Each structure stands twice: as structure tokens, then as C-alpha cells.
Amino acid sequence: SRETLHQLIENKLCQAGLKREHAATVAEVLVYADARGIHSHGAVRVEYYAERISKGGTNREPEFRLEETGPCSAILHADNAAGQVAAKMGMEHAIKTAQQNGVAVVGISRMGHSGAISYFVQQAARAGFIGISMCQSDPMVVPFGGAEIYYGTNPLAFAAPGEGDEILTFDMATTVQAWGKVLDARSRNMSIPDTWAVDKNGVPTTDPFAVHALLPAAGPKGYGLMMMIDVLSGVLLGLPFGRQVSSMYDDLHAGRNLGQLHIVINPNFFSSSELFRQHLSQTMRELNAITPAPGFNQVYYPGQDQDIKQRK
Amino acid sequence: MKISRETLHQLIENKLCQAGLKREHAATVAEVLVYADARGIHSHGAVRVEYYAERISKGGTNREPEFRLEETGPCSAILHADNAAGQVAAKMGMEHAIKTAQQNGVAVVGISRMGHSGAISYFVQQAARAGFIGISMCQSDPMVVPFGGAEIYYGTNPLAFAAPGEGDEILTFDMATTVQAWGKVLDARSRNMSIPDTWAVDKNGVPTTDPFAVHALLPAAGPKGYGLMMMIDVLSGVLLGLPFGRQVSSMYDDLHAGRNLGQLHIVINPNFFSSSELFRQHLSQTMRELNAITPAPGFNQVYYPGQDQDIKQRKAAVEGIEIVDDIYQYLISDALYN
Ligand SMILES: NC(=O)C1=CN([C@@H]2O[C@H](COP(=O)(O)OP(=O)(O)OC[C@H]3O[C@@H](n4cnc5c(N)ncnc54)[C@H](O)[C@@H]3O)[C@@H](O)[C@H]2O)C=CC1
Ligand SMILES: NC(=O)C1=CN([C@@H]2O[C@H](COP(=O)(O)OP(=O)(O)OC[C@H]3O[C@@H](n4cnc5c(N)ncnc54)[C@H](O)[C@@H]3O)[C@@H](O)[C@H]2O)C=CC1
């Protein structure tokens, strides 16, 4: 069960170094990923996290400092704490701030990997607000037209509340595919589609063992989106940016120094929250009623495929 | 033909003024249009004036809007635009966003009930010129199938971003959420070429190479563009209590009726997070480093995002802006439309 795995991972990470409360938080986010089929960011990471913690490449005793910079802005100085802990804490502050003052823009400064980041925007939506989040990731992607890596798979996530317990959740890597698909096609020795990745010369490739770098989604569009995310979650916070961003296997003894940015918007500072939620539910219904194209059994609203996998 | 920036501005300004816009409003509309043309975004340039003139004439764009700025919090506002010209409403709202982020760090400003606002990167460039990060997005005419779908719901719903580098350097990025903007289907309609099958679908949701058989556009990157246009509809439409999704008006529904569109600006003042000087240095460093990346076979250069358009804008300052001669002919003429 869910509370089973939480207890497992909570225990394992608590003994590898983390305060019990920190272990409980990382556990939760990891399960969340596997359940929604986001396996690249689920348990395939758990022994690894345990290692980095034991070796100090993730801070077991971070000195957190939430620095408020304005009525609707803050930086959580996270001291290279586990990303799941840091990002969750900053989102709690963003939610509190948007609750009172309407909007919140909160940077997470110096954290480890934070995982399937839709977890954090769901926090905002469960509180009745719109959540947007994005973060830097290991340099892994060619600029459009390029043969050298610069940005990472730099994800973007969004959630908004509908009626009752309904939430619409959207989450995407800015590459054609997440990296975890390249490794999957490496392990099963499959070939990969030629739209996913390039070789050491920047030429598209079908051999996942000849992959030097991922391609950006929609060419120049994914390129701009990952740039935007690097500027918003990295440059804005004065952190390393672009190619300077650390990679997971550079040094298990050193903090990652990653950044993440949350933006939270309280609907009642703009219009009726009741009608907002009614209209989100209406969006979800209407999209579901759309005539599917040949080949599709249904049209899903964004994220519904994951919402479904979750409950099964 | 190529033409100056000041002259095109004047032509557009006069033509919209005689349609019935206040000269102040017609000026603002004109500079956003010339901005688009200079950057090569011609589908949102002077080509739209004749349409605008008709809508203004027939009352579908408010020539006497009662603007009302409703401040809802320290960093939030709605500009009620009373179906004023979008370029006017969006710029006014961005001026408020800039002022708000200057004093309070961040601003989220809705433009509620406006006409078409054009190449929306104009508005984020305002923020970047003021030293801030600008993000903007707006609803558009239903024209796009959901991923997996065969009926239209969302529009080409654009997203734009700009941030300042050192000096007058700005990094500007601006995209429709479809594989291609609608103008590419219109352009290949004008010259009778088959389009690739990744752009659009027929009435049945089957991808098509026949531009006259196109019923709807496809979202960029499948479900990703789908999610992005939904996000933009939610942020610039649902959030403002406006018509959303398939309810959004289309350009030729009713020329006598206000469009009721929505747009959302988000402005972030880097000074509220870290040194704005080092921020600008790092944006300029980003642009340099991306330019120095080894190009892949086929390419002669790696561009930083938006650099292709910056180059066009730079060239247009030298040689002048290229527009279709037919548009020049209409702008000098005494005809408002037809
Ligand atoms: N350093 C980090 O933390 C990173 C984390 N990630 C995460 O990994 C995950 C990667 O996601 P991707 O492979 O790009 O996702 P994807 O391509 O499978 O799907 C993207 C989005 O579209 C939705 N979607 C997909 N198919 C759909 C359909 N048929 N109908 C309606 N909606 C549909 C998904 O639910 C999801 O919200 C994300 O959770 C992302 O946050 C990714 C990169 C880096
Ligand atoms: N209702 C409205 O007002 C709407 C307005 N629009 C506008 O129409 C325009 C749509 O543009 P798209 O067709 O998506 O543009 P696009 O596909 O040509 O390019 C998108 C972005 O990527 C950049 N880019 C493209 N190729 C590049 C390269 N090789 N290197 C570096 N950067 C590159 C562009 O400069 C641009 O910033 C936008 O200005 C948008 O604001 C679009 C839809 C609706």
C-alpha cells in the first residue's frame, strides 16, 4: 500500500542520515511518481538518494532560511537539503503568501533533485490555488541546431482546482522525451525514435547507446522554454546556470546547488473562486466529450492519463 | 516592398484614426503592428489593419472604452478594458504591471475584455526595457484540436518571455502553442503548395497535406502544447471570469461585437531576488555562450532564443520593414475597407 511504501522509504532514508520528517517527505514524492507512471522519478532513484545522503552530497542537517523579499516574494535558502523537502517547504510558504496577499513567487535556492515536480503544484491546487513550478536539471540537451549540451530537461508543472476534490495537473519535460525513456530503451536494447536524441556530432540517432544529448521538444520552442526555466529558477536566484548546472554523478559528496521557482495565484484576487472551480470542472468534462481522432479511444483532459494510472 | 518604420506607423495610425479610433489609441496599435512586421511576424503586422478598420467602424472594437483598473492586492490587478483595441489595453496593463513590480517586486495583471493584441512579445519587451522579466499570454480564436481530438477547443494561445541583458540587450522568446501559427496555413493557401502533415487535421481529425482541407491545427509537441494552451486559457481566461475554451469568440463571428478576449501579464523584478547587475551579466553571458556552441551538420550557427527575429529587426532598421505592396496600396487609399 501507499502508507506501506512511505514507511519503508521513511525508514530507509532515516537510517541513511535524514531527519525522520525529511525522510517522510522524500518518500511521499517518490511514490507519487511511480503511481502516476512517472517511473524515471520514482523508486529507480531510492538507493541513489540513500547513497548521496550517507556521503553528504545531500545535506542531512540543512540550515533553512526563508528570506521574505516583498509582500509576494521570497527565497528559501535551502542549504542543499533534499529537493523534495526544500521544494515542499517553499511551496507551503508560497501557498500561505498567496492565501493572504494573492500571489506568490518563491525561489528554492540550493537544493538537491526534487523529482516529479507536479507534486508541488498539486499542493497549491489542494489549497484552492493555481500552482506553477519549474526547476533546473542536469545539462543534457542541445540548443536547436547545436552539437554541445547546455540546458537540462528543465520541467514545467501546473495545477488548478476544479470542484470537490478535482484537480487538473499538467507536467512536462522540455525535451521531446524524459531521459528515463532513453535508459529504458537502452536496457531492453530497443532502438529509439529519431526525434528524441542526437549523437556526439549532433546528428539524430536511433541507437540509445550512441546518444550524447537529448533534443528539445518542438525544436526552437522547447529550447526557449528550457531557457526560460533556467532564467526563472536559476539566473534569477544568482545560482549556476545553463551548462554550469551540476549533474547527478559529478560528485556524490557535494551539494547540487539547483534552483526551483514556484508561482502561486489565488483565484479570488481575480474573479469568483466558485465559478473558477466550476469552470475548471467544466473544462475537464468538455474536453472528455470531444470526438476522438481515429486511433484514440477517448480525448483526455491534460494529465488525466496520469490521474487514471494513479487510482488504479 | 520595403518601407520605413516612422512612415508605416503614420499610415497605420491615420487609417485606424479615420476608422474611428482616438489618435492616441491608433498610435499604440500602430507601433505594436510595426514591431511585429520588423521582427518578421507579418501575420500580426500591417496585414491586419483593414480587418481592424472594419471592426472599429462597425463598433466591434471600442473607440471610447471606459478603462477601469481594479487593484485586488499588492501585486495583482485587473484592467477592465471594455473591448478596447487589444494593443492599447495590453500595453496599459503592462505599464501598471511594471509600476507594481518596481514597488512590490512582482505583478500579475489581467487584461479583461479586449480585442486582438497582436505579437504579444511587444508587451514583455516593455518589461525587459524597464529592467524586469516579462511573461505574457492570451486567448485566441478556437482553432486547435485537443491531443487525440477531432473538434476544436482552444486557440493558438501564445506565450512570450523577455529578460534584460547588459545595456540595451534583451532576450525575447515568443511562440504559438500550435505546431505552426495559422498564418502558415493561410500563406500556403495563397500560393497553392501542399503543407506537411504535422501542422493540421481535416474535419475528421486526420492529419492532412491539403491546406484547403484543413479544419483545425494540431498542438505543438502533442500533449505538451495541448497542456500549454490549456494553461494559457486558464490563466488569461478562466482566472478572469471570461469566456474560455470553445466559448472564445472568433475574428469573423460578429464584426459589431466586442471580442471579450483575455490576456495575463506576469512581471518579476530581479532586484527582489538577487543582484540585477549580475542578472543582466548572466543573461548576456547566456546569449554569448549559446552562440558559441558547435552547430550540428546543416546549421551554420547556433542562435540564442529569439535571435532570428532580433536579426530581422536589426536589418529592418537599416533597410526598412518589408510589407506586401497590396497593404501599402490600401493604407494610402481613402477606403476603410473594400
Ligand atoms: N530534474 C527534474 O526534476 C526533472 C523532472 N522531470 C519530470 O519527469 C516527468 C517527465 O514528463 P514527460 O516525459 O515530458 O511527460 P509526458 O510526455 O508523458 O506527458 C506530459 C504531460 O502531458 C500529459 N499527457 C500525456 N499524454 C496525454 C494524453 N494522451 N492526454 C492528455 N494528457 C496527456 C501528461 O499527463 C503530462 O501532464 C515530469 O514529471 C517531469 O516533472 C523531467 C525532467 C527533469
Ligand atoms: N491571438 C494572438 O495574439 C496570437 C499571436 N500570436 C503571435 O504569433 C507569433 C507566433 O510565432 P510562432 O509561429 O510560434 O514562431 P516561431 O515558430 O517562428 O518561433 C518561436 C520562437 O522561437 C524562436 N526561434 C525560432 N527559430 C529559432 C532559431 N533557429 N534559433 C533561435 N530561436 C528561434 C523565435 O524567435 C520565437 O521566439 C508570436 O509573435 C505570437 O505572439 C500567435 C497566436 C495568437
Numbering used by the authors:
A (entry chain B): 4 to 315
B (entry chain A): 1 to 338
Paper text:
This structure represents a metabolic branch point enzyme during (S)-ureidoglycolate utilization, which is the end product of purine catabolism common to plants, as well as some bacteria and fungi. (S)-Ureidoglycolate dehydrogenase AllD belongs to one of eight clades of l-sulfolactate dehydrogenase-like superfamily. The dimeric structure observed in the asymmetric unit represents the functional unit of AllD, consistent with size-exclusion chromatography, in which AllD eluted as a dimer.
The formation of glyoxylate could have occurred through the spontaneous degradation of oxalurate under our experimental conditions, and its binding site could provide the binding mode of (S)-ureidoglycolate substrate. The electron density map for glyoxylate was unambiguous in subunit A, but not in subunit B. The planar molecule glyoxylate is 4.0–5.0 Å over the B-face of the nicotinamide, but with a perpendicular orientation to it. In contrast, the aldehyde carbonyl oxygen orients toward the opposite direction of the nicotimamide ring, and is within 3.9 Å of the nearby residues Asp141 and Met251.
